Design a protein around this ligand. Sequence first.
Ligand SMILES: O=C(O)C(=O)N[C@@H]1O[C@H](CO)[C@@H](O)[C@H](O)[C@H]1O
Ligand SMILES: O=C(O)C(=O)N[C@@H]1O[C@H](CO)[C@@H](O)[C@H](O)[C@H]1O
Ligand SMILES: *Cc1c(COP(=O)(O)O)cnc(C)c1O
Ligand SMILES: *Cc1c(COP(=O)(O)O)cnc(C)c1O
Lengths: 810, 810
Amino acid sequence: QISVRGLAGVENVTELKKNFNRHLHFTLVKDRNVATPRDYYFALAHTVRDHLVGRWIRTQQHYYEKDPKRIYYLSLEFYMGRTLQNTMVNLALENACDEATYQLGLDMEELEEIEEDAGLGNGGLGRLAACFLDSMATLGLAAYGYGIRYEFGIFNQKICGGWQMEEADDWLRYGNPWEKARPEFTLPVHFYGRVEHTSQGAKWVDTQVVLAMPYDTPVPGYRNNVVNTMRLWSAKAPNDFNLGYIQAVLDRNLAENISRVLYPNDNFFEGKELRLKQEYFVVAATLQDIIRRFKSSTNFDAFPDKVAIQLNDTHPSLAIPELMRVLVDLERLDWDKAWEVTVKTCAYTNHTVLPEALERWPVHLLETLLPRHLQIIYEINQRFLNRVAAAFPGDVDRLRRMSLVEEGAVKRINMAHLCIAGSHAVNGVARIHSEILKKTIFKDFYELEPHKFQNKTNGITPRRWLVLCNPGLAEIIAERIGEEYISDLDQLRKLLSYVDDEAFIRDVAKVKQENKLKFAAYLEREYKVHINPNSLFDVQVKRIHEYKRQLLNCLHVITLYNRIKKEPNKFVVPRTVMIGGKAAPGYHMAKMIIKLITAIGDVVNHDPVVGDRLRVIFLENYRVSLAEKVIPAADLSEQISTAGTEASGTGNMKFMLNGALTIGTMDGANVEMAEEAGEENFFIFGMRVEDVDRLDQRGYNAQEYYDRIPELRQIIEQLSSGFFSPKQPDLFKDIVNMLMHHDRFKVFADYEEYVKCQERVSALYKNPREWTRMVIRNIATSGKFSSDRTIAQYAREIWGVEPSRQRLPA
Amino acid sequence: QISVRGLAGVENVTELKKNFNRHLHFTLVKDRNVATPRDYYFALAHTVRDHLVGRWIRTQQHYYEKDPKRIYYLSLEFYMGRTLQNTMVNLALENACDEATYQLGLDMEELEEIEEDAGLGNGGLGRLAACFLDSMATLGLAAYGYGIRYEFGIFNQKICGGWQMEEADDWLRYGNPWEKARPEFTLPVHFYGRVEHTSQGAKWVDTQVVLAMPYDTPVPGYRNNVVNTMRLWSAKAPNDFNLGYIQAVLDRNLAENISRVLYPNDNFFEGKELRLKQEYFVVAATLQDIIRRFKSSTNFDAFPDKVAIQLNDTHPSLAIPELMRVLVDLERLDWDKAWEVTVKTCAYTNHTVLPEALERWPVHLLETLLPRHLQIIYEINQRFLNRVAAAFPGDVDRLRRMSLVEEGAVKRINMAHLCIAGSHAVNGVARIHSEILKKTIFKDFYELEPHKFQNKTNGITPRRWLVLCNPGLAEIIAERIGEEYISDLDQLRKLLSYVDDEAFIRDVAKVKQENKLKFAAYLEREYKVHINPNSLFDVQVKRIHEYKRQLLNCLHVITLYNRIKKEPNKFVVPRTVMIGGKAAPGYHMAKMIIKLITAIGDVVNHDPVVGDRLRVIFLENYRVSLAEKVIPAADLSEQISTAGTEASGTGNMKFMLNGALTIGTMDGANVEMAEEAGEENFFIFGMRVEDVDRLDQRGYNAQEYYDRIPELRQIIEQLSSGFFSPKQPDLFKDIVNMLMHHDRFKVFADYEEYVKCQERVSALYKNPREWTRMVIRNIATSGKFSSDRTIAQYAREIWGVEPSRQRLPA
Ligand SMILES: O=C(O)C(=O)N[C@@H]1O[C@H](CO)[C@@H](O)[C@H](O)[C@H]1O
Ligand SMILES: O=C(O)C(=O)N[C@@H]1O[C@H](CO)[C@@H](O)[C@H](O)[C@H]1O
Ligand SMILES: *Cc1c(COP(=O)(O)O)cnc(C)c1O
Ligand SMILES: *Cc1c(COP(=O)(O)O)cnc(C)c1O
């Protein structure tokens, strides 16, 4: 139908149909009379999958022959989403499959909606890993994503009585056609035990063993015939395990629980033993695999030349002492040599500065679970501090501040300090975040080793976040500048010469309108809920957290409602405010915020006087697949975290690439986005990081804002009196109390400027032509935010490898 | 190579090779450079599997169109063994696959050894179900095997220090290419809850729900293009289950444990709650499936005309009250009508008379787990006893003897009584067993309803137990009488006219010698253990149990050893005594018997004076696949259970069909086997059932035999003094104490006649020609023991359906 979806050749379409019927028959064991839409989805998935295998096998054979430096991206999260459409896009099979299924009397879009999201992530951090895998494959890097194959990913969110309810994400229920179990490469992982010091070296003995079974999933590059691998480990109990008989067999569950479920926390550290087991499990199995592959290429001096390990935050930080353990205890290398290798091999990426998110494991936990690693960590700390003492003689406080071991109630190991000490590179994920790291939390480390600190601003893949979710926009763009931008997003700047092009302006606006109509329809289809497609789509989708300030958005919504009620017959730009996102199960305040949003909707959406001028909808079960639907339909992107809290943000980039304007604070990547597009094409408001610090030095007193702002006072009084919760008048007391007495994120401080800024947004929306022209200026300068650019920087500046856009023979 | 393995056509072999390479590439994602023997096995399994699907789909479509009466065989055990070779045999693809793999440079036999046994059974009972499925498909019956898909089947047995060690049978580790998950047909199963009595009818509410997910495995008939289904249920927790968050997800294990492991008991009842859950789980899911299928064909009067449910022992006995529950509580039929339907639909097969094997569930268990079913059982009992009271007025003891409810310490429900009351047919599995049922344990029931009692002598499938495991024998037989006997075993009688044929005599003996050489080689390959192929192969393989009397065999072995030591230079027919079988993990005496056997081997196998004249080997991990190897190599079959204890036995039939002579008691099917072949061609010895009863009335005193038999006394003294356990002199005290003071199976009573009979066996073995002629007389009359004959009788006399040997168009 459209050009960027490839050719629908005669032979290819015929071949696809035959293979589709072949799988339906031989693979699913069904015939057209009893086949269901799900059967058809699988028939198509297997058919598309077949096209991947050939490239997958030769890509891997290729790396074996050429033996390039391997990149290992370790993460406990890979937020992949669906795989069918992404695979067709990267293999240029979309139109062909669309035609083939059409001729078979099937609607491919309907079939795509059947696939379960691979939700092995919580949010930004896990999605980043997914975008990175796509970019690494597209840039021809010999990269491997290593993680855990959770039986249950992020929970499915149900809203009941306005409250969030969690239910198990049994994503493997119907099977996963994309993965390939590789039981032949199963590896043992050790836990507990004790350390024995013999004549030559220490030995970790009397351990409990859990097997790590790998499952491989193909990661196709964009039209370059490269197919990399994402290897996820699954926990398996050994067969002699616990070997009454029946109970012993049933207790195998204990060991296999390690890969059972993803911890649902976003930017929050929960020091549970099970989580520590998952972290070591992925690290231990992965490192053995890495070393095995290295040996089949004794000379560990060249290890750093053939291996790069990227730690996605501190979750896989045990890779440092585990690598030391293997080199020292098993390979028998001297400490200093092993340490040299480890440092040159490992690199660490920090994704947050919030104190509650930093991993600080109790020593008693490591002591019992990983006795040898604790000893290695102490030795690392001893040697590191000796270096600090030599560089800053007499500075005893620096010593205690930089120690990997924190003293106090219970001794803990600061995993971030461990990562900096054992990595040759440490990076932040946005310019402002990386600067904050050097000026605050990692200042001491930066002064000791300035060369280690870098910045690698985040990005998103333009394949999934443009071509796949917004084909209409990708098409009108391709019509003017070709398709080269899909793997070279910087080319979007050429669109600047069309900012005054009446035809283009009209097409950009038309695509957005179509996306909104499609989404407005979807809302009634799967959720029965009416909305006005002509209104401004104001959306804030991301995990629910106090720092992201969904509450500030709520205050604005209530302000709009109160203004309408005050002057009913006054004209106001119609808005549909959409807020979505999951709250961690144990995060009470976050759950209360969700309830508040639905409560506001209950009042606003049924007030006759408001009419279709204002609607407040809470988007249930926000996930990757839902993001692909709502982002292309958005007009306004809410990125309003308190300055200095959102390390980077990536949703912000997705909105910018898809034609939405941004209202936000100078936080994370928002700063660079505004810099790229020009501040006059961005809706910036609120305190800058410096203003927040000034307020903290002086002391934040929310009461002051409450006393000086009548509209704000009115909102708080409405919340307190039960205006939004008639049957339960004090339902939101916790929220009001927090806002008034212990709001770490200064919601009130940015309220006035936020509301004012929102007024300017509505003013511009009233002028369709100028709004669209500003949109074009944003889309045109979003090129820097492609993860291809991010990965190219990691490749050259950290891993020491050159990216390549060379096609492999298919 | 040989004729009964089909044709190796040019086009077919070429097609097989291509498809083999296709699966290796697309399905396993490997190429000839990294493929392992296991990869090749799977490539072949998928290739053969492809040939099944077409027939599987049309067979099922066929039953839908013609709508014949459906046969549902409910069993908690299906001891299937391997599936690859069996599938090739039934599809006439063996030679073609042999050639195709040959041309690909692969040894098919080597690949077949890679497949894991589907050990979802303990022994005879589970294997019978497997043979039955094969026969039902071969006879064109619309039959379905329904059971549980245990994650872990019968444990793998390891022998350490002469002791049995158990290890989990993780048979699904590498995947199962034969099954097809059918998540779309998942059904809910209820547990616990309580009963509510409303205006119209009772309601079972507040129940805990477990989902039953079916996995279908194809069951091919022998060359008739019929492919039936074996549907096994897997337990799955609902997603709202238990819905801290993490713990709730982990606790899903509780519900899914239902299908985790097979209880490893043979002829022994263990009243554990988990076992009861498994029993109801299979019954509840199966009945819903049955009714669903029936409705898609309101008129339950015709239910018995379209449905037959066969209960494999009492394990699935809850089908009776469950069917009543559904008809009365859900369909709203009046009791009497529902009962009429239930009785005409259900039939029960008893497999044992041992008291410790009978299922007697504590009322408190049913009360808590299945409250509605207990009420239904009480009502059934009330009405049944009213019938008994009317037929035998004033006979109050009969009432208490026949009650489904047993009074005493704890009230229990006699499931066997429940089955007889709710079934229109009750059968034993061998003529003598069925007679014992009418004369003893079920005498009262037989007097009340004589018409219900029948006999259906067991059988074994000649496909797996002849053509598959002994192609050499199948070939020489086919050479003389054709291939028709494979699905009409009675034709083997034609071999009687070859009993004097010198050529045939020579071939029969040659095949046996080849099988022995092959097995003798296997023993050194996988177990490193030397044996003499020229010796008489004396084997007893079956589950270890006191009633099977492996101990009597041990006494004979020790007797042989003592006789040799007494007169070293006297000639004796060389023997290799092989004993194998698993012991239930909690069956202490059985485990002690295994230790005794290995202990005897330790002494006998290393005594220089004995030389290669006597060897005692314990066959480790006896399973279906091992049975296929050792049975064709056997000369003497040990079937020595105490008269009246082995209901039928089936291993006995396998040995007879494969050219081994039988030494045994007049127990189970041994009686009919001797009757068929002629007593002069069988080695019968010991007490008959009547002799056992006489001994019991008089009182069994083992001391008497010990005092009158010097050789026996010597053996007991050797055991007691530590002759077979130097380091642990009293190691076998429990065994001696049991034999001397509480031997329920009168081992000593049959010792003298057994040893005497064994002497006649050795005498005949010394005359190769006459031994073989007797073998021919056995093989020639083994036709009655084909499970095709057994199933044909079940079909006509119980299910009311006619078997058919008509091919379906392929
Ligand atoms: O640490 C977390 O839980 C987490 O999701 N951190 C997230 O990582 C993303 C990728 O770098 C950043 O863009 C987000 O600003 C940060 O909060
Ligand atoms: O009940 C058991 O555990 C069991 O295996 N019973 C077995 O069933 C077989 C099939 O009918 C019979 O041939 C055996 O004699 C009987 O012990
Ligand atoms: C991109 C994405 C995120 C991250 O969004 P931010 O607004 O940067 O926090 C979270 N969840 C999903 C499903 C995403 O697609
Ligand atoms: C046939 C068979 C049995 C039953 O043997 P019996 O001697 O009748 O008890 C038990 N186990 C296996 C593996 C079998 O093949």
